Structures are given as structure tokens and as C-alpha cells.
DNA sequence: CCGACCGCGCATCAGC
DNA sequence: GCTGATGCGCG
DNA sequence: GTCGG
């Protein structure tokens, strides 16, 4: 937290661009700035020496330099100040609302917590389970909950079919003393590249998981892509724990790598390694990294045996999870 | 300058 | 019903 | 908003 004052800074300034002028790469240049800088091993004492960090421009520099002077921006208390935008940014912390929707409501006259209580009618399914949990989606949760969810998940599903294989991915995976949510990467050996074996290999899991009760709601629900809620269960006479999300991704076996490489991230590395990728005449999904042609068509899957054989096609050192937190 | 900025699953809607 | 666009969300 | 060519 060496520069967390501009970083903060830098952090709200993305999320006003994304959320209230929809501007979508002014919202990843402030991200990506944030990132470098939350990454840079020394308290900054200029907007020169920011600038000298590849993502860092000229006006990012100027705010810089009035944040260090004066420890606030002009641009920020006056958006602060703002009714619309203040009420826009709010309404998308529920999940479920974006940009969109959240303007579509303010201009409904639908700006406050209270206002969406009232109006559960006009929400979609994803946002009426959002509105329900939205002040336990906001907290996070401790690696020690983590560590019991976990238990949970791989056990369960080892009772479905021991030949499923779970892997926690996401923050967990990099290490983090706490996390925004669960992320569970999931494979069978009936579903590959080249054939699915078994139907519902999804379902049975988030079935059973349900019939445990440790899933409570679903936000949405594919053949290979689960989202919802969960809960840890708790004792006689103790309180509850609060309502988590939990994200399953269903990704075929021979395609693991590829799978893991994305579900474990960040959102920030998985961006900067994709674009280098492209840099190097690759392109990079969760399934598989493809050669590009000399006219930039994708070719046909490469042969990867680890997340390793990835950064290798890229010319880059390996970098274990743990040190991909951008 | 300026185009080029990752990549994709699921839900919802318009148009047919 | 299907296809395509869009919104939202995952990392 | 940034920056590579
Ligand atoms: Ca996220
Ligand atoms: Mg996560
Ligand atoms: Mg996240
Ligand atoms: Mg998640």
C-alpha cells in the first residue's frame, strides 16, 4: 500500500468511466495505470517519475501531481458531488446492473437501496438475488473460510463421481489472504476437445451441491458455466455465515492448462498476457493458445503439457500464481 | 498522428 | 423457434 | 487514456 492513496485514486476514476460515461478503454487505461503503480517498489513523489511507467500518460501524470499536492482531485469531489453519477455508480454495485440498467433505473427515479427494495418487479432474475445479498456480496471472505469451502466443494463432488477433478482457482489460487469469491475449475474425463460422453456433468455437481445445501442460489446456469451463491454451514447457537459467490466452470479435460492459466488470473494479468500473446503472432483463450497466420487467422491449437509450455510460447518467464496479482 | 486495446458464457431482446 | 446483437459478468 | 509504429 506504498502509493495506495493514488491507486485508490486512479481505481475511481476507472470505475466513473465504466460505470457512468460507458467508456470502456478510458475505464481499462486508469486500471491498467493503477496496476503498474501498485506494483512499483517505491512511495512516488511525482507525476515525472509516474510517468515513466509504461500505461502512465501525460494526464494521469497532471493527477498525479494535484493528488500529491493538495491529497485529493478536483475531477473526483466534483463527481462525488454529482446526484446522477453518484446514484448511476451505486446502483451497479448490485450484481446483475451494469451501466446500462443502472442509468435505464436512475432515470426511472430508482436511485437507492430502498428504491430497488420496493421495485423487485421490475429486476431480472440476476439482479433480485444481487439486491438480496448485496450487503453480504460486499464482504470478503477470510482464506480460513476458503479452506472449509473448498473441503466442501472437492468433497462433494468426489461423492458424484470420483473421477470429477475440482481445482479452487482464482485469488485462492494466487495465494491471497482473502478472497471476492469462490472460482471452482472442473473436469471429467467423459467431456474433451473431442467428444462429451456424459450429458449434465455440470448439473450433477451443482445438484448435489444444492441438495447440501451449500449452494442456495443460482445467478445463471449453462452446460459449462455455473454462477451463484453458496453458504458455509454453521453450528448450534452460532450466527451465519454470510452468502458467498461461487463461480463453476466446466472446461474440457485435455483443455486444463489453458483452463487454469485463465480461471486463476487476475483479470488484469490474463489482459496483459493475452496482448502479448498477440504481440508474438499468438492468441490466447481459456481453451487453447493458436499460432496466427500471416494474414491473423487463428491456427490450429498448439500442444501444451503445463501452464508453463504457455509462457514459453510467448517468450516469457513463468510466473507462478502467486505473482500474477496485477 | 492514429488504430488498436483480450476473449468468451449466459440472459435477454428484436426481428423474422 | 432461431440468429444476431447487446448487457453483464468472469479471470 | 495511452502509446507503437
Ligand atoms: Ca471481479
Ligand atoms: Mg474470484
Ligand atoms: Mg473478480
Ligand atoms: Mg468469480
Redesign the pocket.
Known amino acids: 500500500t506504498l502509493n495506495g492513496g493514488i491507486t485508490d485514486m486512479l481505481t475511481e476514476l476507472a470505475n466513473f468511466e465504466k460505470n457512468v460515461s460507458q467508456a470502456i478503454?478510458?475505464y481499462?487505461?486508469?486500471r491498467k495505470?493503477a496496476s503498474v503503480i501498485a506494483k512499483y517498489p517505491h512511495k512516488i513523489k511525482s507525476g515525472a517519475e509516474a510517468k515513466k511507467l509504461?500505461?502512465?500518460?501525460?494526464?494521469?501524470?497532471e493527477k498525479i501531481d494535484e493528488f500529491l499536492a493538495t491529497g485529493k482531485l478536483r475531477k473526483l469531489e466534483k463527481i462525488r458531488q454529482d446526484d446522477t453519477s453518484s446514484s448511476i455508480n451505486f446502483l451497479?454495485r448490485v450484481?446483475?446492473?451494469?451501466?446500462?440498467?443502472?442509468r435505464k433505473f436512475v432515470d426511472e427515479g430508482i436511485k437507492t437501496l430502498e428504491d430497488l427494495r420496493k421495485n423487485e418487479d421490475k429486476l431480472?432474475?440476476?439482479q433480485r438475488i444481487g439486491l438480496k445479498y448485496f450487503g453480504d456480496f460486499e464482504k470478503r471472505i477470510p482464506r480460513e473460510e476458503m479452506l472449509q469451502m473448498q473441503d466442501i466443494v472437492l468433497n462433494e463432488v468426489k461423492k458424484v463421481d470420483s473421477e470429477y477433478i475440482a481445482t479452487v482457482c482464482?485469488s485462492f489460487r494466487r495465494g491471497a489472504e482473502s478472497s471476492?469469491?469462490m472460482?471452482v475449475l472442473l473436469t471429467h474425463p467423459s467431456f474433451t476437445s473431442e467428444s462429451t460422453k456424459q450429458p449434465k456433468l455440470l448439473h450433477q455437481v451443482v445438484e448435489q451441491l444444492q441438495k447440501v445445501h451449500f449452494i442456495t442460489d443460482t445467478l445463471?446456469?449453462?452446460?459449462?458455466?455455473f454462477?451463484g451463491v453458496c453458504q458455509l454451514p454453521s453450528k448450534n447457537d452460532e450466527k451465519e455465515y454470510p452468502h458467498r459467490?461461487i463461480?463453476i466452470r466446466l472446461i474440457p479435460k485435455d483443455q486444463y492448462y489453458c483452463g487454469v492459466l485463465?480461471?486463476?488470473?487476475?483479470?488484469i494479468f490474463?489482459?496483459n498476457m493475452?496482448?502479448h500473446?498477440?504481440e508474438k503472432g499468438f492468441?490466447?483463450?481459456?481453451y487453447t493458445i493458436r499460432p496466427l497466420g500471416v494474414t491473423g487467422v487463428a491456427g490450429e491449437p498448439l500442444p501444451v503439457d503445463s501452464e508453463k509450455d504457455i509462457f514459453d510460447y510467448i517468450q516469457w518467464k513463468y510466473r507462478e500464481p502467486k505473482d500474477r496479482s496485477e
Open positions: 478503454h478510458k481499462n487505461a486508469y495505470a509504461p500505461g502512465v500518460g501525460t494526464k494521469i501524470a451497479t450484481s446483475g446492473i451494469g451501466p446500462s440498467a443502472a431480472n432474475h440476476h482464482g471476492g469469491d472460482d445463471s446456469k449453462g452446460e459449462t458455466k454462477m459467490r463461480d485463465y480461471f486463476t488470473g487476475s483479470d490474463n489482459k493475452r496482448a500473446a498477440l492468441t490466447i483463450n481459456e
